[PDB]
Amino acid sequence: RKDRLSEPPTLALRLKPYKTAIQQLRSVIRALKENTTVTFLPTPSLILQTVRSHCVSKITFNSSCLYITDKSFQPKTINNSTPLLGNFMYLTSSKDLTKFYVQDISDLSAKISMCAPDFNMEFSSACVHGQDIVRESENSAVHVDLDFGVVADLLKWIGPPTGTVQILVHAGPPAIKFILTNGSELEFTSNNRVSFHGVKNMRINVQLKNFYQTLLNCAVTKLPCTLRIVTEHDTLLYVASRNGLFAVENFLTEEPFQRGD
Amino acid sequence: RKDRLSEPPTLALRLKPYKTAIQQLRSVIRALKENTTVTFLPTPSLILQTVRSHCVSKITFNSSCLYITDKSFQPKTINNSTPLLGNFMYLTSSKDLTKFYVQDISDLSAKISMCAPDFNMEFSSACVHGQDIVRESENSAVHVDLDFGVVADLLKWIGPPTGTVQILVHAGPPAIKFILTNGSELEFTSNNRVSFHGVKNMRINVQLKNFYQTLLNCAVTKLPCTLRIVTEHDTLLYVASRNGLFAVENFLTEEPFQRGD
Numbered sequence A, B: 001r002k003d004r005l006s007e008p009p010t011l012a013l014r015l016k017p018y019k020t021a022i023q024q025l026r027s028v029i030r031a032l033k034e035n036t037t038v039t040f041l042p043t044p045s046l047i048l049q050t051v052r053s054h055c056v057s058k059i060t061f062n063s064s065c066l067y068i069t070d071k072s073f074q075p076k077t078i079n080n081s082t083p084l085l086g087n088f089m090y091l092t093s094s095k096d097l098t099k100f101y102v103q104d105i106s107d108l109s110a111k112i113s114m115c116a117p118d119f120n121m122e123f124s125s126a127c128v129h130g131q132d133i134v135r136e137s138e139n140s141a142v143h144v145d146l147d148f149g150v151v152a153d154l155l156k157w158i159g160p161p162t163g164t165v166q167i168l169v170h171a172g173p174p175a176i177k178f179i180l181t182n183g184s185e186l187e188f189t190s191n192n193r194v195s196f197h198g199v200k201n202m203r204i205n206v207q208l209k210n211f212y213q214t215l216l217n218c219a220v221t222k223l224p225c226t227l228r229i230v231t232e233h234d235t236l237l238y239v240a241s242r243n244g245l246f247a248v249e250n251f252l253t254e255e256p257f258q259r260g261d
């Protein structure tokens, strides 16, 4: 055309940070379940969400990975499981990826472009719905930060429904107790490696499989890990860990154990 | 535009025949070696070629699979191994494939479009060279057709360099002898299941691994199989089998066994 320029809003991945994060995460990415969602936001942000039985898991890439040309970019959530490609996020963890951007060309779909040395491809996936808003905009009733050394001790101790783990929190003094069904309890009291910010005398029960998976997911950061028991409405357990590149968050509901039908 | 219509030359797959052939071939397709080539011809034709040590293997899809809009479509050969997708022909054997065509838009590349229910993608790969012409436009000095029952007997008998098999052909009367290094020979004389069209008293030696692989490849047709010993220049063994959808051809050179440096 001859007037003034115009390119559709474009959400681009910055390769060096993104490639660093997707390698660190390549364990989690290949294991992503068939119903996993990818969301692109003009914030900018990129969110992987997996909704399970009693667990919602979320992986948020932060701005350091993203460049957005134009903030009128409309939000898009697509299925990670893609009709011919399969695991889309896995595709992006290829080593010879050179360009990776998303364009807002239709309100109905999302145009993904990817490049490699002497090759380029694009596809569009239908936008799914949505809006699958499930966020931690609610503050904790008990909040505990665990040094990573503690995360590994927990993992190592849970080895190994197919079981539940009880979590007990004391207030005076503060302590946190992990109670398996077999009569073994693992406890942490105040010390340089576990910080109790807010705390009250309470207990919830979660599924052991999910909590273990949850802990594995946070441990990719090899950084501290945040444990919250939100008492909003649904009794909730929040486990999360983050670095400069991304944030692993997990929302586990208590297994209904208080009467009961 | 406002004048007369114009669409770039397009080589399209007819799904029902193509999907039938790619399923019948899904064993061979996934095993395709990293250096496998795909060629698109305005004939129309589609050719998969693999060049090995002493073996060139070729899979030709015939017209019943292809529709060509415009015969000015330029020939294109690309790598099957694709920078982000990996095995391209494997990708096309997906069950929810709904459209598969190739367009001549650049003399330098090939634009592949593929569709699935609510999804579509395209990519271009650089045209490689070429021209990798290796064809059977030379007639046999010995030519033997084997009933499929014979192909399976051969396969079953070769169980199981890492060995060679000698192939001996008699002329008066005609017979064909397969001689392993261990002193076991398998012979076929004239009967309703092996037809000797042209024949002379000669022997060549080929690598056992390749010949066995070659036989496996022809056997996907469960139809007769053509055995030729071309005496052009390079002493050559040709093994092939075809159906209405495609043609498996194999060119094996004799292992230099006649002095010798």
Ligand SMILES: */C=C1/C=Cc2csc(SC)c2C1=O
Residues within 6 Å of the ligand: A168, A177, A185
């Ligand atoms: C974690 C709990 C609180 C302390 C304590 C003393 S004895 C015993 S076993 C019922 C406990 C306990 O489980």
Ligand SMILES: */C=C1/C=Cc2csc(SC)c2C1=O
Residues within 6 Å of the ligand: B168, B177, B185
């Ligand atoms: C296939 C060959 C031709 C017939 C025959 C008779 S004895 C013997 S062993 C040297 C053969 C043979 O190998």
Ligand SMILES: */C=C1\C=Cc2csc(SC)c2C1=O
Residues within 6 Å of the ligand: A001, A002
């Ligand atoms: C009318 C225009 C404005 C610039 C330009 C450069 S090449 C090309 S194609 C005819 C054009 C164009 O379309």
Ligand SMILES: */C=C1\C=Cc2csc(SC)c2C1=O
Residues within 6 Å of the ligand: A039, A047, A049, A058, A075, A077, A131, A132, A133, A134, A135
């Ligand atoms: C926490 C999530 C989960 C996916 C999704 C779809 S739209 C949107 S904006 C708040 C989100 C999100 O942030």
Ligand SMILES: */C=C1\C=Cc2csc(SC)c2C1=O
Residues within 6 Å of the ligand: B001, B002
């Ligand atoms: C000038 C033309 C000729 C037909 C047509 C139908 S919709 C559309 S977009 C302005 C056109 C066009 O470009």
Ligand SMILES: */C=C1\C=Cc2csc(SC)c2C1=O
Residues within 6 Å of the ligand: B039, B047, B049, B058, B075, B077, B131, B132, B133, B134, B135
């Ligand atoms: C026998 C082959 C092998 C690949 C190729 C590239 S171009 C062309 S045309 C004769 C061929 C071919 O037919």
